[PDB]
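Quick entry between incubations.
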Amino acid sequence: SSKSVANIIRKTIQREQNRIRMLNQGLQAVSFGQVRGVRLNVNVRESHAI
Amino acid sequence: VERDEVAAQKRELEKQIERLSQPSGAEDSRMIALAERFGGVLLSEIYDD
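Done. Structure below.
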């Protein structure tokens, strides 16, 4: 059960990262003042990865 | 002798039960590494539902 829980957490994290990366493509090259692009950076915290 | 025979049957039963356990019951002994090492998905899992 613990192994399954870990695997499902990993799978959900991967899916969400993929979805956010997909969404990010639409905000490429937005010209606002000196701002030229916007990104939602998603990462896995080490304190929780371990 | 009866106890050992029953124990052998038992061990076979738990091995069979485990073989269907994770990630989706299959030849997970090496199928796991063979599956995540490459950007693919198990066919059985693909037809899981």
